[PDB]
Design an enzyme around this catalytic site. Structure first.
Site, PDB file in Angstrom:
ATOM      1  N   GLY A  53      83.333  48.346 130.342  1.00  0.00           N
ATOM      2  CA  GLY A  53      84.086  49.133 131.288  1.00  0.00           C
ATOM      3  C   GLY A  53      84.486  50.550 130.897  1.00  0.00           C
ATOM      4  N   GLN A  54      84.205  50.982 129.670  1.00  0.00           N
ATOM      5  CA  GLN A  54      84.522  52.370 129.339  1.00  0.00           C
ATOM      6  C   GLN A  54      83.570  53.313 130.081  1.00  0.00           C
TER       7      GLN A  54
END
Lengths: 159, 91
Positions: A53-54
């Protein structure tokens, strides 16, 4: 059944996946990439794509959209600053043509933390009520205990 | 596939199939049609999806191959970013 699990960084996506696969709570590193695993629940074999998710990785999810039967969207219920951002990511995800008929399962996670927002609160903030075009469900979870995880797999399998 | 410019629908199918050989062959077939100079962007999401993180060199090498001869043109599965699907998991 093909499953795409995404959400902002630190929501608990890998913790969820390896709790499900290993019955174990592992010590995660941020996922720069994906993890892909197969999990058996009640005669279904779910192939889960946990995609980091970064930001850099977030830009890459669209390659995993195609062929997705169901979407697990993990939210950290304790992080109120990033809930709007989650809402923004998820809303345009809902606009994706490859995700058009995929079952939508939100995990409001880290429910174990004292100030975690409730699933109802999260439902209002993410705008879930406004999805009329496909199946959605929200489930309170704790990935470390395992709470709500299989209730999720259950709902999903009933697509 | 020596040079066959309409075959892009079959390549998408061949590109993900659950069989690694087929995927490699597909991506290979894309390379040979571009080098001659023929149609290639339809495929992009499929192409990019299996290979990305892996240390398994052959598919990675194949994808790495396709990024020096047309990366800029193809945009279905890549689009425009700083850490594109050319290099994000290729770190």
């Amino acid at each position: 059944m093909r499953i795409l699990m995404v959400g902002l960084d630190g929501a608990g996506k890998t913790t969820v996946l390896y709790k499900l696969k290993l019955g174990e709570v592992i010590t995660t590193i941020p996922t720069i990439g994906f993890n892909v695993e197969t999990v058996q629940y009640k005669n279904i074999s779910f192939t889960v794509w946990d995609v980091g998710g970064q930001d850099r990785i977030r830009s890459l999810w669209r390659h995993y959209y195609r062929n997705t039967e169901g979407v697990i969207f993990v939210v950290d219920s304790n992080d109120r600053s990033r809930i709007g951002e989650a809402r923004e990511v998820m809303q345009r995800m809902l606009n994706e043509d490859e995700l058009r008929n995929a079952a939508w399962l939100v995990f409001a996670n880290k429910q174990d933390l004292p100030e975690a927002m409730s699933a109802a609160e999260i439902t209002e903030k993410l705008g879930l009520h406004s999805i009329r075009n496909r199946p959605w469900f929200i489930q309170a979870t704790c990935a470390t205990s395992g709470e709500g995880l299989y209730e999720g797999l259950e709902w999903l399998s009933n697509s | 596939m020596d040079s066959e410019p309409p075959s892009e629908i079959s390549l998408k199918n061949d590109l993900e199939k659950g069989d690694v050989k087929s995927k490699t062959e597909a991506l290979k077939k894309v390379i040979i049609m571009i080098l001659n100079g023929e149609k290639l962007p339809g495929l992009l999401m499929t192409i990019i999806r299996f290979v990305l993180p892996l240390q398994d060199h052959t598919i990675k090498k194949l994808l790495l191959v396709f990024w020096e001869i047309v990366p800029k043109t193809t945009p279905d599965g890549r689009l425009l970013h700083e850490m594109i699907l050319v290099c994000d998991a290729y770190r």
